What we know:
The structure is a homodimer of 307-residue chains.
Chain A: E1 25-28, E2 63-69, E3 75-80, E4 106-115, E5 120-129, E6 141-146, E7 158-166, E8 205-213, E9 216-219, E10 224-227, H1 231-240, E11 248-254, E12 261-268, E13 272-276, E14 281-282, E15 290-297
Parallel strand pairs in A: 7-9
Antiparallel strand pairs in A: 1-8, 1-14, 2-3, 2-7, 3-6, 4-5, 4-7, 5-6, 8-10, 8-13, 11-12, 11-15, 12-13
PDB class: viral protein
Keywords: Crystal Structures, P Domain, Norovirus VA387, Blood Group Trisaccharides type A, viral protein
Assembly: dimeric
Amino acid sequence: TKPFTVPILTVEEMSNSRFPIPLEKLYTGPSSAFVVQPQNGRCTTDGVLLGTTQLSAVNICTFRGDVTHIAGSHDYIMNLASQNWNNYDPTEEIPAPLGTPDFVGKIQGMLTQTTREDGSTRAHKATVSTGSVHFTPKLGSVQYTTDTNNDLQTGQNTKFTPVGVIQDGNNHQNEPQQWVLPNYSGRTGHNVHLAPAVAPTFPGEQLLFFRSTMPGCSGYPNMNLDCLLPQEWVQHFYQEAAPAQSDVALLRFVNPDTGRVLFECKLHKSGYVTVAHTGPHDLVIPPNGYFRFDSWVNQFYTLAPMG
Amino acid sequence: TKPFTVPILTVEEMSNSRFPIPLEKLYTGPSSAFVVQPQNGRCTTDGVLLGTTQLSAVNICTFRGDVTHIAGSHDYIMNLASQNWNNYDPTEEIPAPLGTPDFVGKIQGMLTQTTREDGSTRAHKATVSTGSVHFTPKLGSVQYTTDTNNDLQTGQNTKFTPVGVIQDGNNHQNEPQQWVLPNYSGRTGHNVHLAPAVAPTFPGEQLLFFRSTMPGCSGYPNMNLDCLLPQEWVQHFYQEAAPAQSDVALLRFVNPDTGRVLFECKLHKSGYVTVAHTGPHDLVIPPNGYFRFDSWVNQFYTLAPMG
Ligand SMILES: CC(=O)N[C@H]1C(O[C@@H]2[C@@H](O)[C@@H](CO)O[C@@H](O)[C@@H]2O[C@@H]2O[C@@H](C)[C@@H](O)[C@@H](O)[C@@H]2O)O[C@H](CO)[C@H](O)[C@@H]1O
Ligand SMILES: CC(=O)N[C@H]1C(O[C@@H]2[C@@H](O)[C@@H](CO)O[C@@H](O)[C@@H]2O[C@@H]2O[C@@H](C)[C@@H](O)[C@@H](O)[C@@H]2O)O[C@H](CO)[C@H](O)[C@@H]1O
């Protein structure tokens, strides 16, 4: 049978699958207080993409289409196009366009546009509030609060490039909320075709998150962003499409220098990782370490307690 | 021997290796008038990274470090850190930090910063002119023309996220110049440890470029950006590290729908692709097509003329 494997990449060599920035560290902690149901960075070890997960790390949280001004303000509405600038098909059995942001927050970036007639271009600071009723990606439209008006033509391809997140008012780090999904259709209807929610079932285990720090653009935003799988694991499983001979793949985080194993963890075929530990812990790892697939085990396997 | 392969990805599913944006099309054209020596997106089919090439598609043209204002202006100097925020080591035998931009142009983006003390964050529009004498990545410092002053503390981790390119004055599309390398050490010294220059040697052949359109942020900039290898081919070869049984791998671009071959091309072990054709041509390809490795051939192999 086609042998299953995980890429030979260190945490630092990989990318966050929920925002286009690199991974930074490994974090584990209880998650019973939240609803862990991210839509980006979801894929079976089998290579089956779930939720809004697509293959490009650079296309996460980006939007394309044309815009129309909202006279009397600095806001604009973007009628979404498919990532390759074609018509957007709402009919697809997906929660929203692949790559759409999967958390409630205010993403700040820039809108860039080119007038097809003369090669005339322009850019403007922009922010998208995914919790806004006007955040309707699934219906094909999103709204941005801009730094201007006047300069942004209609019927012209416009792109939004994400940079980071902002935060307002007291009660610091109150937003964004990485674990609260936005309403892809807004008020028009509930979310559909979602990747299931995730939770560690086996006693004594906690989810292992692949963490990054989204850049802050204003205020005191909660910049922690945890994904369940590095973007290159998604890309790799999709390429390999190796059959799961069990529902849990045993992985060992090894140090290529000392040649020794630091800890071991469970890679669930559904596409998420758990470790044996209780409490919030920032994993201390040798920069050159990487994950290695050792073997398929049953779901009743008890992992050696993580460091 | 470990069998060589190329990923099963369509052009649209892949990323440009010279700017963090997705690929868009395939372009071929004469290149004798220029010096094709890009430093990003360079890797042997063997898996040996060359030039300033690193594995993350999202880390291309990004910079990290801290800044100090240039009193009397809206400009700032950033003392560069390594991508993981550690000290930058100029001693490495590389042209510049991995991922540094490899063309002369004005890249516009945003600088983002967080005050480690309170979780205070801020962002500002910024532009880096790689042709500027102050563009000294190799020495560990770069300079940005900002939209402000006052708001940007020192001794605080600051990041630059690229968005697109700008252009000034008449003579439209005069800049940027994707084929002119910047001086990583500025005036202090010539470039070093460069990936070699590339040129089609075999008669009747032209380089095959993997093209994207960088977003324009002002003026009439030349937005064409050609890389020699998609970023995922770099990532793939690096993973596989398959030995080259010859110096040229024969590839066929196939349509998974019709099951038929569109054209064939040469993937040089040095890391670049050539096709049999003369003149500028935007390749017309079925959106689902992808490259497939068929076999190693000698360097005297004559390719069937590209469509
Ligand atoms: C956009 C702007 O005006 N920036 C100024 C500035 O402004 C800020 C504004 O967004 C108000 C709204 O209530 O909130 C402040 O928090 C925000 O400042 C930003 O966040 C704080 C936490 C710090 O990180 C600031 O450095 C950051 O800009 O005022 C400051 C000085 O008072 C600057 O002029 C800044 O460019
Ligand atoms: C930054 C700014 O002031 N933007 C304005 C604007 O300004 C432009 C400025 O950068 C001058 C400098 O000589 O060059 C212009 O080219 C640039 O305009 C920009 O490029 C042109 C080719 C068009 O694509 C413009 O839409 C684009 O902004 O003036 C315009 C109206 O005159 C707007 O107010 C814009 O926000």
